[PDB]
Each structure stands twice: as C-alpha cells, then as structure tokens.
C-alpha cells in the first residue's frame, strides 16, 4: 500500500497473510474455514496467517493454519488476469473472535465513487522498495468504468474494476495481491493488478467479487 496509513493492530480482522516462507499475498477470511484471494497468488503449500499485525513478530493473536485446498476459478486466464479469484480452504477451522473475523460477501455490486478500504503488507513506495512490518490501510473510491478503460485500453473485462486516485500517490502495490477491497462492510474487490504503483492515470485494478458470489457459495458447498 502506497500513500496509506497504519491500520492499528487487528482493526482489519478479516485480513490474512498468505505465507510460503515469507508473506507473498493477502487474502480475506469469509468464514471459519475459507479465504478469498487472487488466482494469480496460487502456490502449493500456502500457510494462512490470521490475526496478524506485525507479520515479522509473533504478538499473540495470530493463528497460522495450513491451506488444505486452493481452488482457482475454472475460467481464470493467466494471460489477461480475467477471473482472478481463488478460494482457499483451511486445514482446520479458525477460531473466530474480535481479532479474527469474517467479512460479508456482497448482496449487490458497488457503484463508482463508493469509498473502500484496501489493506495489505505490500510495498509502500511508488519508486523504491520498502515493506512494512505492520498492516497498512488505504481509503479509495471505486472509479467509473470509462476512467478504468481509458487508463487500460482493451484490458478491463466485466470482472474487473479500478479503484484509487488518477492524480497518483495512493494505491495498492506488489505484496498486496489477493487482499481485500471492502466497501460499506462488504468484500467487493480483490487486489489484482496495475501499471506500476501509485502512478498518475494508472489506478489499481481489482477483481469484481459481486460477479462470483454464486461460485463462492457453490465451491464452499462442494468442498
């Protein structure tokens, strides 16, 4: 997250860290045994880290749980990043509490201009590399499809939306993929891709979660 602020420990209790040795992606807890992330975050052998704030120091509220299944969307296209969503089942159910809590799935899509909370442990610099110990947060609006398509000609499918600031300075970044975009208490987006970070006219591009709510429900019921 570039241009954000320190969230405060466990203030975003649905935020998880995906870990294959080190933190590489975020994700969102949607119930005690399931996590939503990006399909491009797929790895075998992921360990999910819930209740994190400082990912580099065990502080006492964490739950580390192995992924038993990681299910990429069946229409995921790695070339265009169309359908960039993945469901991760936890080997054992998490213990839900005030620091480890699920986030609701949408019951309608969000509209442009709606303010969202985007979070993660990704790079904080638009020019350079600086990874934070603690969870970073960014409030950003959803952008109009025309703005998104103008920034990224021919690249934006109906399963994507842009969020951020066309003037630059405030964006998600590498290390944030798969993490949440929450709007009015609903998971509307997943960190997916962008051209650079926090660059002018290059806003973040996010998987449109409302297009997948049946898939999520059916995948959960089926596994």
């Amino acid at each position: 997250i570039v241009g954000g602020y320190t969230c405060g420990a466990n203030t975003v209790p649905y935020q998880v860290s995906l870990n294959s040795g080190y933190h590489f992606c975020g994700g969102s807890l949607i119930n005690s045994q399931w996590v939503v992330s990006a399909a491009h975050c797929y790895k075998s052998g992921i360990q999910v880290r819930l209740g994190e704030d400082n990912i580099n120091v065990v502080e006492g509220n964490e739950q580390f749980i192995s992924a038993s299944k990681s299910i990429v969307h069946p229409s995921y296209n790695s070339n265009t990043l169309n359908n960039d969503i993945m469901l991760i089942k936890l080997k054992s159910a998490a213990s839900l509490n005030s620091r480890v809590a699920s986030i609701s799935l949408p019951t309608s899509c969000a509209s442009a201009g709606t303010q969202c909370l985007i979070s993660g442990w990704g790079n904080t610099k638009s020019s350079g590399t600086s990874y934070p110990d603690v969870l970073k947060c960014l409030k950003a609006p959803i952008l109009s499809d025309s703005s998104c398509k103008s920034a990224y000609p021919g690249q934006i499918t109906s399963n994507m939306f842009c969020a951020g600031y066309l003037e630059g300075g405030k964006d998600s970044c590498q290390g944030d993929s798969g993490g949440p975009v929450v709007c009015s208490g609903k998971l509307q987006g997943i960190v997916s891709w962008g051209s650079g970070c926090a660059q002018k006219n290059k806003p973040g591009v996010y998987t449109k979660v409302c297009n997948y709510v049946s898939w999520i429900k059916q995948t959960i019921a089926s596994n």
């Binding site: 080190y22 590489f24 992606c25 590399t129 990874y131 590498q174 891709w193």
Partner: protein, 56 residues
Amino acid sequence: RPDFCELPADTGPCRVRFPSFYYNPDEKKCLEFIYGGCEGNANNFITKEECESTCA
C-alpha cells in the same frame, strides 16, 4: 553478455511479492527489485549469482 541485461527492471502488472535481481548498467551491478509474478522481461533473476554471472 545478452542484450536483455540492458532492459529496465520490470515488476510486471501483478501485485504479488517475488524478491528478484536485475542488472543495472548505470551502477554496473545486479540490484534487488520486486517482481510481481507475471509478465516482466528477461532481466529478472532469482539469484544475485546468476544475475552477475550473466550480465556483470
């Protein structure tokens, strides 16, 4: 040494964290950059050793 050693560091569009190395000609050494996991270019090494071996 291959032509790609001259290419700029390219994180690519994906927003994953993959620690990587690229050859920087202005500094005449291999430096760290963060690769996002997709696309990018050939100036992209998992190890500093290979980066130096190929480009330095």
